[PDB]
Design a protein around this ligand. Sequence first.
Ligand SMILES: OC[C@H]1O[C@@H](O[C@H]2[C@H](O)[C@@H](O)[C@H](O)O[C@@H]2CO)[C@H](O)[C@@H](O)[C@H]1O
Length: 135
Amino acid sequence: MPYNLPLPGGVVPRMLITILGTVKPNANRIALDFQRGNDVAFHFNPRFNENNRRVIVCNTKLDNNWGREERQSVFPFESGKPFKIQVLVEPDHFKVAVNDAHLLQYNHRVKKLNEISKLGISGDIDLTSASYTMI
Ligand SMILES: OC[C@H]1O[C@@H](O[C@H]2[C@H](O)[C@@H](O)[C@H](O)O[C@@H]2CO)[C@H](O)[C@@H](O)[C@H]1O
């Protein structure tokens, strides 16, 4: 939707990625796509209305096939409101916090973290900034 944050050197433990923005009015979806070639190592997809239920769907795409979805009902996003998403990389999983509160963790399926060269940021949001640092 369709911005891309380059991750030279790929993903590595201790890396902290921060995304700041504002959810658009009447938002329908948001998506973060950690890409490794044509695969999607980590797909973070907040859905504002899936049968009148809000849900965050996470999955991985390998060789054009989506794997086992990991769903989370806790949904801190709100249409028209600013947000902050922080993705902390651990050797065994991606740690996600929103508005400074832990939200979920997604265990790595794609093991070669170094090959995850970019983070796609899309969906119904107004992007302020996307950056990363080491902690
Ligand atoms: O898993 C992430 C992936 O989901 C796709 O939609 C799924 C839907 O969530 C699932 O309930 C249904 O059984 O199959 C659909 C197709 O795989 C999204 O289209 C895709 O963009 C990702 O969000």
